[PDB]
Structures are given as structure tokens and as C-alpha cells.
Amino acid sequence: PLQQTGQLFGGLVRDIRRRYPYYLSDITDAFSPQVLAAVIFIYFAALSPAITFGGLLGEKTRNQMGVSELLISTAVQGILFALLGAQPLLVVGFSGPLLVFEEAFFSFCETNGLEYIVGRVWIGFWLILLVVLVVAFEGSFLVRFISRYTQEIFSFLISLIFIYETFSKLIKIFQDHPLQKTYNYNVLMVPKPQGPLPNTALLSLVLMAGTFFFAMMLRKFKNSSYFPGKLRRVIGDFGVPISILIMVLVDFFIQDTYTQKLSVPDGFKVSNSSARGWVIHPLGLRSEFPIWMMFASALPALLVFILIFLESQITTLIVSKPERKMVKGSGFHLDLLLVVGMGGVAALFGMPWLSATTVRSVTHANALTVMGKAQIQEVKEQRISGLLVAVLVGLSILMEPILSRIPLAVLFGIFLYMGVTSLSGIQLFDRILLLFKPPKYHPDVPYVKRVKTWRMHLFTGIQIICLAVLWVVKSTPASLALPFVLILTVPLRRVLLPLIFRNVELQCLDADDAKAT
Amino acid sequence: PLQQTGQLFGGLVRDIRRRYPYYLSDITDAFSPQVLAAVIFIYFAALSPAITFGGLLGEKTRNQMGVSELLISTAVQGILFALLGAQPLLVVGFSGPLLVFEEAFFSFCETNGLEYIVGRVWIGFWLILLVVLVVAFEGSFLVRFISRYTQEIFSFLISLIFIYETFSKLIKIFQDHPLQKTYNYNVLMVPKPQGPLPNTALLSLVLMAGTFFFAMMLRKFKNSSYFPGKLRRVIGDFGVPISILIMVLVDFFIQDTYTQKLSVPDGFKVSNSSARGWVIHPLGLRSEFPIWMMFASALPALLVFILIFLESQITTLIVSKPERKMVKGSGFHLDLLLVVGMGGVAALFGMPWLSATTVRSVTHANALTVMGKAQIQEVKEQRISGLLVAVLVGLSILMEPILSRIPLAVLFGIFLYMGVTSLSGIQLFDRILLLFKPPKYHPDVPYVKRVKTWRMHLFTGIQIICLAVLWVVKSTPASLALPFVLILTVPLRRVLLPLIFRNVELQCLDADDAKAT
Amino acid sequence: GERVQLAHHFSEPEITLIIFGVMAGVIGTILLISYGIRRL
Amino acid sequence: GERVQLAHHFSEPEITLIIFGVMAGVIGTILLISYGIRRL
Ligand SMILES: CCCCCCCC(=O)OC[C@H](COP(=O)(O)O[C@@H]1[C@H](O)[C@H](O)[C@@H](OP(=O)(O)O)[C@H](OP(=O)(O)O)[C@H]1O)OC(=O)CCCCCCC
Ligand SMILES: CCCCCCCC(=O)OC[C@H](COP(=O)(O)O[C@@H]1[C@H](O)[C@H](O)[C@@H](OP(=O)(O)O)[C@H](OP(=O)(O)O)[C@H]1O)OC(=O)CCCCCCC
Ligand SMILES: *[C@@H]1O[C@H](CO)[C@@H](O[C@@H]2O[C@H](CO)[C@@H](O)[C@H](O)[C@H]2NC(C)=O)[C@H](O)[C@H]1NC(C)=O
Ligand SMILES: *[C@@H]1O[C@H](CO)[C@@H](O[C@@H]2O[C@H](CO)[C@@H](O)[C@H](O)[C@H]2NC(C)=O)[C@H](O)[C@H]1NC(C)=O
Ligand SMILES: CC(C)CCC[C@@H](C)[C@H]1CC[C@H]2[C@@H]3CC=C4C[C@@H](O)CC[C@]4(C)[C@H]3CC[C@]12C
Ligand SMILES: CC(C)CCC[C@@H](C)[C@H]1CC[C@H]2[C@@H]3CC=C4C[C@@H](O)CC[C@]4(C)[C@H]3CC[C@]12C
């Protein structure tokens, strides 16, 4: 998939011929309850971050782009990616770096008196130019130099960030309603409670802990020896929906106490009808858009392309490792082309561009993973699950009375479960666990039986320094430089690491398929 | 240990010659941090039920016997049993059936216009006569007819009762402070809150869940492969004290929310100074005690003797099984004599008689159990642990500032941990688990590989019916008939069970040492 | 004791010694009887 | 679109068609240049 053909659009054509023969199997392989359980999982797992990021975007951009535009873009891009992509297990949705770029671009447009949405239209227009040149010149072959080092560093960092944000949301919930000796019983509730309320933060903590506990116990019960095997596996597959339903019913049977619920818009309308319409004129809405920004938008378009490219390609590398039993193939050229082109098209309608997020796609792959008697058996590789998730995301506005009864704390426990389950296949997490173990308890694995203990510990600690550096960058206004610092790990693997480690040590510690040299 | 010699006090002399040679080891074997951790565990595990039962007794008997008398009796009897007992790992304390008998006897004395504490004095006088004859005539040899059937039924029932009471206390806490939309912020707090308070029930639930979670996680960390083995086992031994300290700090740093704390009496004084002194006259305090009730006290003495005998002997059977690696010997005659004689003597001072409680003694044995390279290796059998527990129970009054900052929810989580950990060694609980498992996952045990699956399931179901019958009797006003119905299981095992099961099946299912016939 | 208690001819140590002596006498009589049985 | 918008010479489909045509021309020019190179 990463070979260079030398022909224009050579990678694009090979990716199509690699996967599209399996298009008929991509529908028939979904006839299983595990696919439906994965749909119910990924629907909430993509809807709740979408709602949160849409609210943040509306707050930070004066509602020029908000919840409704993000939901519509997510639905359309997910549907078109599931119908036409080469790796349908990827989940197309909004991400944090995209929000940071939107913040920076809105600030830049406000400073220079530029129309933000027209600048977004021009950036998306420049986005289409970049992706066509990259795909035609086989620019997606450069991802072959991203070995297990950078992939696992990025995945571990993203999982830690997800867990940190999940806990910080509960911390903010506690700060909004602190535990006090006295409360004001006359507190306005619309649109949100303007004062602290009793029993709120504690009930949110209880709901999150119970959701996480039930999810983990059902995950254990899947591999357990109790019940008949078919019924036990069916229950284990629906473990996350069962936990969500149980905690939702628990919160529903507590009428008096208030808990924050999901909030979707009233209808399929723009967030601000006083600012922009559904189609934004590239020449300007209120003021004439200057000519110079039409060429100056290439650099922000370059940054957006770098962000989306790194995110989607590293996610595709993670989800398509040979150890995950992927036997249908993935496309690095077709998927990138589809994602960036759809982002550029949606930019014309004033809708946010999206990328293949890491945590959501990894959770989608894991929810379709079939486990044998410890050993991964197969993966339910099909296009129906992502298509149904996107359709339900689009229909989330019409089903407000169902979503309005689901607390966020249940979703917080679900996100914690996703974060703790996204660290399974990372060897960096395994070697971090070996830092707190005696050397005699280390497993019989190639990177332990052929490498000395202190050498492996030093190799792991080098990655820890990279994780700390990447975390510090995110805590700075220049968090859009995170892709560049992440790329800087690739020279570290191929220039500085060989200066201290032998060839066999680097082969064992950084192996493309976890082999013993 | 249960053989009949035919000599007057024959069993008593043999018990002394069996254990007292190991008296030197019973002090030097306690020099280990595991013993200190077990002391810290059993101190709370015996103090909290003592406080609860003393409060209940004071409320139900107009403070004739209360917290202070029960604490002093527990301290004195525990010290004397640790110094002179043949099975020092037993924890002697107040129990539920004792509370039921005290309620019934107080009702009888109030109906007949009698002095309740003087009636208790005369019962204790009759108690000494019965135990001396039983010990001299080797009446403890009847315990050898209490097989694994009755022992496991009693242990499972008592553990279920303990867990049910632990959950019912949390239910009561939730009921007293329900989750309401509004609360009265000005509510009198002394001695207890007169109205519902915010965040109380939810914080209690959080504290209990966190305590249980931390205790279970540290117990699993003991057997884990993390940290150096010495430090790992040291931390695992102190799992319960560490969890208690963590949750105590968590509740301590939450100033505003109110949680119920441990309450101990102000000083070493009788609960009601207007009713009785420290020494109660056997002929009466206010009115002359009738002569007929002096001879009529034999029947309540018989009931108390039956209750204490069954509890102590079944507890000794459970804690001294050969499969628990108890290689120091246990004395049935000496322990019974000590317990009943101490109860009869303390009856004179108005102090309650105690019995060898099952859950506390099993927890004390398990907290001193050393696990080798999954398999029980040895038990820290020594007298210092119980002596220190009794001394700390006696000193609990003087350490009020320490106890006044410890919530009850922490102790509720500790009780849940004790209840779930007391079910490990019961084969009845193991065969209950096999009811939800396919037969191919059943373990390699004599009662599976030599008996048909449905026969074993029927044998388990017969035991479950006995558990339900014993549970119904407990939930009735005639709950003092529980020892008789429990004894009636012995004819069921020795008579009716062979009519439906073969000798090999009963040997495999009911094995005194888990042997394959 | 506490408050005002009814007057008795025997004090607490005296009455408890008498009761324990009667109990010990009964125990000894029962032991002697049991020794007499199982022999003749 | 919404409220009052400035009136331009080209409508939205016209201007987006012009922009797409310019983009296609640039892509074709780049591809023709790349085809010319690597051969001579
Ligand atoms: C609720 C279901 C109906 C209840 C009515 C109760 C009546 C009832 O349910 O019996 C039917 C069936 C017995 O059939 P059976 O034991 O043969 O079923 C085996 C069981 O399903 C194993 O899990 C399978 O292994 P795996 O997991 O795939 O690896 C095994 O397949 P294989 O590998 O050997 O070829 C199966 O053979 O149930 C049970 O499994 C016993 C535990 C039931 C637990 C009791 C139910 C709580
Ligand atoms: C805070 C702890 C100290 C920090 C200082 C960090 C420095 C530090 O702690 O190294 C010392 C020691 C290494 O020495 P070493 O590995 O030889 O020690 C072995 C270890 O104690 C095993 O647990 C023992 O087996 P078991 O359990 O009885 O079955 C084994 O006994 P044996 O059966 O072979 O005869 C011991 O030999 O520790 C570690 O084990 C490595 C994991 C350290 C992880 C520490 C992560 C914090
Ligand atoms: C929708 O957009 C309009 C402008 O397009 C916003 O109106 C502005 O609101 C900000 C906030 O105080 C101020 O600059 C002015 O009150 C308004 N400016 C102009 C030029 O009218 C409006 O607030 C937006 N809607 C929402 C919900 O934020
Ligand atoms: C201590 O004992 C005395 C008498 O035994 C209790 O006083 C009685 O209280 C009950 C409850 O109302 C009633 O029978 C009478 O008011 C009292 N009767 C007599 C004869 O005094 C006193 O309540 C006990 N102390 C406590 C704290 O309960
Ligand atoms: C990278 C993609 C977006 C194409 C590159 C953009 C440049 C080369 C082209 C594409 C379309 C062009 C515009 C087409 C039409 C007009 C209207 C005219 O009255 C002023 C110039 C203006 C506004 C042009 C400026 C230059 C322009 C923006
Ligand atoms: C089983 C133990 C308690 C001993 C058996 C009790 C019987 C046999 C004995 C032991 C102590 C005895 C009492 C001791 C003292 C007195 C006071 C005296 O003015 C009248 C008789 C009277 C009231 C006795 C009656 C009989 C008595 C109650």
C-alpha cells in the first residue's frame, strides 16, 4: 500500500482495486449483532464530542460555525466516506487541533477585518489544490517512514489527552456546583443553572464511576467462563449500550436532582442567521473580500493539510497493523483524497473540515474485533457501521427527546472506558508497565528476550521525554506546531537512536510486525 | 482434636497440652508487618459492630446495657481469650442473635415487672453451671458431627446477612437524607441532623464505593507482578489500612458536607447511672428479686448456651480446617469453657456475654494468611494480634479525637470487602458459581470429575433451599429458633441425603479435607 | 451501686460467694454420681 | 443568502465554476510540466 509506482494517480488506482472487489463483502459481513452494538457505541462516541466541539466553536467564533453545521458536515462526510472510502473503519469528525486553528483564524480575521467564513471558503479551495497534487504525485507514500515509534507516541499522547480532558470535564462540573453547607433553592434553570445546585457533582461522579464499572465488568464478562458462549458473547458485545441504558435509567429514576444532559439544536438551520447563509459567496458577504487573501490563504491551507494528513495517515497506520488481523486492505491515497476533498467542499458551505480521528477510529475497530480462545481472531470489516453512525448523527436533531434524557456523566464514563481500552495494542504502554515490574516477570517477547533490561528502559524513557515535550507544546498558544514536533521524532528514530543502540535492539524495540529480528 | 477420652475434663486437659507448648511461638511469630496490618484491620472490624450493637442495646433497654459496657466487656474478654485461649485467632464479640435474645429478655422482664440486669446476672450464674458440666463430660465432642455441609451453610448464610446489613445501612443513610430539589439550610445538628441534608447520601455512597474499590485493588496488587516483592507484599498486607486512611483524608478535606462519624462514650462510666452501678446485686437493685425466677433462668441460660456453643464451635471448625494450613492445633473444650465462663462472670458486672463471631474471626485468620507461589502456605498464628485488638478496643474511648474524624461509609466499604472476601473458601459458593457455568469450564475437583453435573447441581440446590429456610426464620419474630433449624441440617446430611445420593457422591461433595474419597 | 438500692442481709461478695459455693457443691455431687455410675 | 448581502458581478455558481476551472488549469499545467520533465 505504501509502495511508489511512479505513475500519476498510481496509488489512488491501486487503493481502489485493493478494496472495491470486497465491496459486496463490505455489506454482507455486517449481518451480525456485534456490528449493531458497535453502531450504538460509535454513534454516541462521535455525537458527544461533536456537540461539545460545536458548542465551543459557536462560543469562539460568534456562532458563525456551530453545533448544527458541524453535525451536518459530520453526517455528510461520514456517509460519503463510508460509501467510497478504502478503510471504512475510520471515523470522520472534528478534533482539537482543528478547533485551535479555527480560534487562530477567527482571531486573525477579527484583527485584520477579514470575513472569517469567506477566508474559510478560500482555504478550503486551496485545500483541494494541495490534495490533488499530493495524490497524483503519490505523496501518500511518505507515510512508510512513520514506524512504530511515532505511531505509538502519537497514540499514547492522544489517549492521555482524551483521558485528561474527560477528567477535567468532571472537575469543571464539580467547580460549577461545589459542595456547600448551604444552597440557594431559588436558582434560575434556563438556559443553564446560574448557581450551584446540591447533589449534582456527586451524582455526576457516581454516574461516571458506575458507567465505567459496568462497561469494564461486561468487558470481563465477555471473556468470562459464565453463561452459554453465544449468549455470553452477545451480552459482552452489547456491554457499552447496556451500561449506557442502565445508567440512563438510574438517572431517569432520580427526578429531583439535576444533571447536565445532551443538547442538540432545534432544527437544520445555521447557528447565526444574521451572519451567513448555507452557501457563502467567495467574493464576500458584507464587505468586498480582498484579492491578496485569496493567495495568502495557502499557508493556513498548508497547515490544515499537514494536520489532517498526519492525523488521518497515522490513524490509518494504527488501525491497519498486521497484528490487528486486517485482511481486507487499506488505502492511504484514496482516503486522504476523499477526506481533504470533502473538507474543501464543505468549506464552501461554511461547514467545518474533518479528519480521521484516532480515538474514535480505534474504538470503532476494537468494537468490531472478534477475539479467539487472548488472540485476535478477525475484525468485522464492513461499511455499514460507519454509514449507520453517520446517518444517526445526521438524524440526532430529529431525536432530541431521546438524547435529552442521557446525562453527560454517563458519556464521561464511556469516554474513560474508550481511553483505557485504546491502550491495548501500544507497545509503549506495555514497556511503561514494565518499568514497575521486576525483570523476571517480563513476558517472553522479542523486545525483552533479545534486549538488556536497562537498554529497554532507556529506550522507553526516551519516548517519555518526547511525550512530555509534546504535552508541553499543547499547553502553549503554538499548539498548531504539534504536528511538526511529532514529525521531529522520525529523525530521532533514524539519526539519533542508531547512535546509541545496536541494529538488533532497534529491530526488536521498533518492529513493523513485532518480530525477533 | 474431637476424640472422646472418657476422663472427666479429658478434652480440657488435652487442649492445654496441645496448644500451650506453642506459647513461646505465639509471641515471637507476631514480629511481622502483616500482624500489625491485621491488628489495624480487626480493630475497626470489631469496634464498629461493638459501637452499633451498644447503641442498639442502649436504645432498646433504656441504657441498662450500652456502648460503654459492651466495649469494656469486649476488651476484657478479648484480652483473656487471647492470653489463655487455644485458638487465639477467634475474635469474641457481640452478635445479632445476642441482641435478639437481649430484646426478648428485656421484653419479658418489662412485662413481668422484673429487674432485667438482675435476670441477666442469674442467667450468667446458670451459664457457668452448664459449661462446666459440658466441658467435664466432653460435650464438645458432638462438634465432630458438624460436617462441611452445616459449616458451609452457616458461613454462607452469615456472610449474606453481613453484606445485606451493610447495604441496608447505606439504604438507611440514603432514606434519611434523600435527594431533594430544596433543603432547609438551617437544621439543628446535635445530636443528629433533624432533617435531610444536601450531598450527605451521595458522599456516603462515594466513600463506601471508593473504600471497597481501593481495598480490592490493593488486594489484587498483592498478588500482582508489580514493584519489588517485599514492598509489594508489605503494601498488600496494609491494603485495608491504606484504603481507610485515603478515604478518611478524602472525607476530611471536604469540610462543608456532613457525614456521620464514629461516636464513643465520654468516659469509663455506666450507660445509665440512674439505673445500675458497676456491680449488680444478684438479689435485686430496687426490688427484691423473686425466688422462682432464680430457678426459671435455666431455659434462657439453655438458649444462650446453645447460641454461643453453635456460633463458637462452627467458627472454630471454619477457621481450623486442615486445608487452611493451621499446623498449631485448636481446642474446642478450652475455648468454649473460656467464652461461657467469661460471659457468666461479666453478667455479674452488667456486661454483655459474647461469642466467637464468624465473620470477624474468618477475617482475622485471612488477614494473617500467607500466600505462597494461589496456594495457602502458612498462617501467622499468634496471640499478640487478638490481644492488641482487644487492647485497642478498650482504649477506643480514650482515642476519641482519632475516631471522631472517621466516617461510617469507610467502614461500610470495609464491611463489604470483608463480606466478599469471606466467601473464598466456601465450596458451597463455588458450586453456586458452577450453576451459571457450562460443564466444560468446571474445575478439576473431586466433586466434578467423579459426580455427574446435574447430580452436583441438585445437591447444591438442596443446600440453597436450606439457605432460604434459614433466611426466612431470621426475618421472623421467632428468629431465636435459627440454631435448631441449623442443627436440623445434620440429620438431613446423615439420613435423607444418602437416600438420594451414593456414598461416593456424598464423599466427594461433603469432604472434610476436599479429598477424592 | 448507684442512686438508692434496696438493703440486703448479704452483700454482693457474700451472696456471690454463697451462690458459687452452692454451684460448686452441685457440680461436685454430679461428678461423684457420674463416678459412681459406669463402675457398678 | 441571509439578510442583505453585497451584490457582485458573478453569482455563487458562476464564481465557483470559475475558481474550479482555474484550479483545474493549474493542476493540468503542473501535470504537463511533470510529464515533460523526467523524459528529456
Ligand atoms: C439463559 C439460557 C437458558 C437457561 C436455561 C438453562 C439450560 C441451558 O442453558 O443449557 C443449555 C446449554 C448447555 O449446552 P452446552 O453446555 O453444551 O453449551 C456449551 C457452552 O455454550 C459453552 O460456552 C461453549 O463453549 P464456548 O463458550 O463457545 O467456547 C460450548 O461449545 P463447544 O466449544 O464445547 O463446542 C457449548 O457446548 O447451556 C450451557 O451452556 C450450560 C450453562 C448454562 C448456564 C445456566 C443459565 C444461567
Ligand atoms: C519504590 C521502589 C524502589 C524504587 C527504586 C528502583 C530500583 C529497584 O527497585 O530495583 C531493585 C529491585 C531489583 O532487584 P531484583 O529484581 O533482583 O529483586 C527481585 C524482586 O524483588 C522480585 O520481586 C523477587 O521475586 P518475588 O516477588 O519474591 O517472587 C526476587 O526474588 P527471587 O525470587 O528472585 O529470589 C528479587 O530478586 O527491584 C526490582 O525488582 C525491579 C522492579 C522495580 C520497580 C520499582 C518501580 C517504582
Ligand atoms: C450573530 O452575528 C451578529 C453579527 O453578525 C452578532 O451581533 C454582534 O454581537 C456582538 C456581541 O456583543 C457585538 O459585536 C454586536 O452586538 C453585534 N455586532 C454587529 C456588527 O451587529 C450576534 O451576536 C451573533 N449571534 C450570536 C448568538 O452570537
Ligand atoms: C435510665 O433509667 C431510668 C429508669 O430506669 C429511665 O427513666 C425512665 O425513662 C422512661 C422513658 O420515658 C420512663 O419509663 C420514665 O420516664 C423513667 N422511669 C423511671 C422509673 O425513672 C431513663 O430514661 C434511663 N436513661 C436513658 C438515657 O434512657
Ligand atoms: C488555489 C485556487 C483557489 C485557485 C487559485 C486562485 C487564483 C489563481 C484565482 C482563481 C479565481 C480568480 C478570481 C476570478 C475572478 C475574479 C473577479 C475579478 O473582478 C477580480 C479578480 C478575481 C477575484 C480573480 C482573482 C484571482 C483568482 C482568485
Ligand atoms: C445454678 C446456680 C445459679 C446455683 C443454683 C441455684 C439455687 C440451687 C440456689 C443457689 C443460691 C441460692 C440462694 C442463696 C441465698 C438466698 C437468700 C436466703 O435468704 C433465702 C434463700 C436464697 C434465695 C437461696 C435460694 C436457693 C439458691 C437460688
Residue B366 vs residues A341, A356, B155, C22, D19: alpha-carbon distances, Å: 65, 52, 14, 44, 79
Q: Taking a C-beta distance cutoff of 8 angstroms, is the pair C13, B118 a contact? A: no
Q: Which of the listed residues B109, B117, B118, B272 should we mutate to test ligand 4's pocket, taking the one with most ligand atoms within 8 A of CB?
A: B272
B376 - beta bridge partners? B371
Q: Which of the listed residues D22, D23, D30 should we mutate to test ligand 5's pocket, taking the one with most ligand atoms within 8 A of CB?
A: D22
Q: Is A229 in the pocket of ligand 1 (CB under 6 A)?
A: yes
Whether A436 has its CB under 8 Å from any CB of chain B: the answer is yes
CB atoms within 10 A of CB B360: 24
- 3-class DSSP state of B515: coil
Tell me which ligand sits closest to the C-alpha of residue B441: 1
Whether C17 has its CB under 8 Å from any CB of chain B: the answer is no
Amino acid identity of B20?
Answer: Y
User: Which grid cell is A66?
Assistant: 456551530
Minimum Cα–Cα distance from A131: chain D residue: D27
- Nearest-Cα distance to chain A for D38, in Å, is 11
CA–CA separation, A41 and A245 (whole Å): 12
CA–CA separation, A319 and A312 (whole Å): 10
CA–CA separation, B155 and B422 (whole Å): 8
DSSP 8-state code for residue B145 = G
Q: Are residues B450 and B317 in the same domain?
A: no
Tell whether A78 is covered by a domain: yes
Chain-centroid distance of CA A175 in Å reads: 27
Chain-centroid distance of CA A39 in Å reads: 16
CA–CA separation, B493 and B291 (whole Å): 44
- 3-class DSSP state of B20: helix
CA–CA separation, B345 and A299 (whole Å): 93
Cβ distance B281 to C3 less than 8 Å, yes or no, reads no
Residue B352: exposure state from Cβ atoms within 10 A (0-12, 13-18, ≥19) = buried
Residue B105: exposure state from Cβ atoms within 10 A (0-12, 13-18, ≥19) = buried
Tell whether A374 is covered by a domain: yes
User: Which grid cell is A370?
Assistant: 472478534
Cβ-count burial A197-215 (b if 16+ within 10 Å, e if not): bbbbbbbbbbbbbbbbbbb
Helix boundaries (H) for A349-493: 358-367, 384-394, 400-403, 408-421, 427-433, 446-449, 453-474, 482-487, 489-491
User: Which grid cell is A472?
Assistant: 508541553
DSSP 8-state code for residue B481 = G
**Site of grid cell 441477666:** B120
CA–CA separation, B117 and B350 (whole Å): 6
> What residues contact residue D25 under an 8 Å CB cut-off, 6+ apart?
none
Q: Are residues A255 and A400 in the same domain?
A: yes
Cβ-count burial A460-499 (b if 16+ within 10 Å, e if not): bebbeebbeebeebbeeeebbebbeebeebeebbeeebee
Q: How far is the CA of B392 from the centre of ligand 4 (A)?
A: 32
Minimum Cα–Cα distance from B294: chain C residue: C19
Tell whether A164 is covered by a domain: no
Asked, as a colleague might, if the bond just before B352 is cis with ω within 30 of 0, I would say no
CA–CA separation, A515 and A517 (whole Å): 6
3-class secondary structure per residue, A225-274:
CCCCHHHHHHHHHCHHHHHHHHHHHHHHCCCCCCCCECCCCCCCCCCCCC
- 3-class DSSP state of B101: helix
The residue count for chain B:
517
Q: Is D17 in the pocket of ligand 5 (CB under 6 A)?
A: no
Minimum Cα–Cα distance from D9: chain A residue: A283
Q: Taking a C-beta distance cutoff of 8 angstroms, is the pair B166, B419 a contact? A: yes
Question: Which residue in A351, A346, A348, A343 sits closest to A283, CA to CA?
Answer: A348
Question: Which residue in A119, A9, A26, A46 sits closest to A379, CA to CA?
Answer: A26
Q: Are residues B18 and B132 in the same domain?
A: yes
Tell whether B294 is covered by a domain: yes
Helix boundaries (H) for B85-199: 96-111, 116-136, 148-176
> What residues contact residue D40 under an 8 Å CB cut-off, 6+ apart?
none
Q: Taking a C-beta distance cutoff of 8 angstroms, is the pair B119, B293 a contact? A: yes
Q: Are residues A129 and A18 in the same domain?
A: yes
DSSP A325-372: T--S---TTHHHHHHHHHHHHHHHTT----EE-HHHHHHHHHHTEEE-
- 3-class DSSP state of A455: helix
Where does a domain end: B360, B382, B398?
Answer: B398
Residue B122 vs residues B100, B173, B282, B296, B341: alpha-carbon distances, Å: 18, 39, 7, 9, 13
CA–CA separation, B428 and A71 (whole Å): 55
CA–CA separation, B178 and B155 (whole Å): 34
Q: Is A438 in the pocket of ligand 2 (CB under 6 A)?
A: yes
Query: Which member of B178, B202, B226 has the closest CB to residue A437?
Result: B226
CA–CA separation, B442 and B424 (whole Å): 16
Whether C18 has its CB under 8 Å from any CB of chain B: the answer is no
Question: What residues in chain A have their Cβ under 8 A from chain D's Cβ atoms?
Answer: 8, 125, 128-129, 132-133, 136-137, 270, 273-288, 348
Chain-centroid distance of CA A441 in Å reads: 34
Q: Are residues A85 and A144 in the same domain?
A: yes
Minimum Cα–Cα distance from D13: chain A residue: A281
Q: How was this structure determined?
A: cryo-EM
Tell whether B355 is covered by a domain: yes
Rg (CA), chain D: 17
CA–CA separation, B130 and B127 (whole Å): 5
Asked, as a colleague might, if the bond just before B491 is cis with ω within 30 of 0, I would say no
Amino acid identity of A350?
Answer: G
Interhelix angle A408-421/A33-60, rounded to 10 degrees, is: 110
Query: Which member of A198, A206, A437 has the closest CB to residue B198?
Result: A198
DSSP 8-state code for residue B65 = S
Cβ distance A283 to D3 less than 8 Å, yes or no, reads no
Q: Taking a C-beta distance cutoff of 8 angstroms, is the pair B391, B478 a contact? A: no
User: Which grid cell is A216?
Assistant: 469494564
Question: Which residue in B486, B516, B514 sits closest to B155, CA to CA?
Answer: B486
Cα dihedral angle (B252, B256, B260, B261), rounded to 10 degrees? 30
Query: Which member of B133, B281, B282 has the closest CB to residue C27?
Result: B133
CA–CA separation, A25 and A43 (whole Å): 23
Angle at A320 between CA A314 and CA A321, to 5 degrees: 95
Touching partners of A (3+ C-beta pairs < 8 Å): B, D
Best D8, D9, D35, D37 member to test A by mutation, with max A CBs in 10 Å, is D8
Within 8 A of C1 by CB-CB distance, chain B residues are 276-281, 285
User: Which grid cell is A169?
Assistant: 470535564
CA–CA separation, B453 and B430 (whole Å): 14
Residue B279 zone, left/alpha/beta (φ > 0; ψ -120 to 50; rest)? beta
The Cβ-side half-sphere exposure at A18, using a 13 Å CA radius, reads 21
User: Which grid cell is B160?
Assistant: 449474606
CA–CA separation, C25 and C21 (whole Å): 6
User: Which grid cell is D6?
Assistant: 453585497
Q: Is B507 in the pocket of ligand 4 (CB under 6 A)?
A: no
Q: How far is the CA of B229 from the centre of ligand 2 (A)?
A: 6
Q: Are residues B45 and B137 in the same domain?
A: yes
Range of the domain at A310: 10-157+297-394
Amino acid identity of A359?
Answer: V
Angle at B245 between CA B243 and CA B251, to 5 degrees: 100
- Resolution in Å equals 3.3
Q: Taking a C-beta distance cutoff of 8 angstroms, is the pair D32, D25 a contact? A: no
User: Which run of H or of E encompasses A502?
Assistant: none
Q: What are phi and psi of A355, to 5 degrees?
A: -145, 165
Q: Are residues A312 and A400 in the same domain?
A: no
Tell whether B207 is covered by a domain: no
Cβ-count burial B109-140 (b if 16+ within 10 Å, e if not): beeeebbbbbbbbbbbbbbbbbbbebbbbbbb
Q: How far is the CA of B493 from the centre of ligand 3 (A)?
A: 84
Question: Which residue in B413, B379, B330 sits closest to B163, CA to CA?
Answer: B413
CB atoms within 10 A of CB B228: 11
Chain-centroid distance of CA D26 in Å reads: 8
Tell whether B206 is covered by a domain: no
Chain-centroid distance of CA B198 in Å reads: 34
CB atoms within 10 A of CB B373: 5
Residue A246 vs residues A212, A239, A252, B202: alpha-carbon distances, Å: 12, 10, 10, 18
User: Which grid cell is A277?
Assistant: 447563509
Question: What residues in chain B have their Cβ under 8 A from chain C's Cβ atoms?
Answer: 8, 125, 128-129, 132-133, 136-137, 270, 273-288, 348
Q: Are residues B392 and B295 in the same domain?
A: yes
Q: What are phi and psi of B180, to 5 degrees?
A: -115, 160
Q: What are phi and psi of A379, to 5 degrees?
A: -125, 130
For residue A437, the ligand 2 atom closest to its alpha carbon is 42
CA–CA separation, A215 and A239 (whole Å): 6
Tell whether B362 is covered by a domain: yes
Q: Does C touch B (3+ CB pairs < 8 Å)?
A: yes
Q: Are residues B392 and B437 in the same domain?
A: no
Whether A250 has its CB under 8 Å from any CB of chain B: the answer is no
Q: Are residues A26 and A139 in the same domain?
A: yes
Tell me which ligand sits closest to the C-alpha of residue A234: 1
Q: Are residues A50 and A99 in the same domain?
A: yes
Residue A100 vs residues A162, B81, C20: alpha-carbon distances, Å: 16, 71, 90
CA–CA separation, C17 and C23 (whole Å): 10
Q: How far is the CA of B267 from the centre of ligand 4 (A)?
A: 21
What is the number of structural domains in chain A?
3
For residue A62, the ligand 3 atom closest to its alpha carbon is 28
Q: Are residues B137 and B17 in the same domain?
A: yes
> What residues contact residue B461 under an 8 Å CB cut-off, 6+ apart?
none
Q: Taking a C-beta distance cutoff of 8 angstroms, is the pair B135, B11 a contact? A: yes
Amino acid identity of A340?
Answer: V
User: Which grid cell is B169?
Assistant: 445501612
Where does a domain end: B381, B398, B415?
Answer: B398
Q: Taking a C-beta distance cutoff of 8 angstroms, is the pair B351, B123 a contact? A: no
3-class secondary structure per residue, B240-297:
HHHHHHHHHHHHHCCCCCCCCECCCCCCCCCCCCCCCCCCCCCCCCCCCCCHHHHHHC
CA–CA separation, B502 and B499 (whole Å): 8
- 3-class DSSP state of B47: helix
DSSP B429-447: HHHHHGGGS-GGG--S-HH
| Helices and strands (H, E) in chain C, number of each type | 1, 0
Q: Taking a C-beta distance cutoff of 8 angstroms, is the pair B107, B423 a contact? A: no
Q: How far is the CA of A291 from the centre of ligand 3 (A)?
A: 26
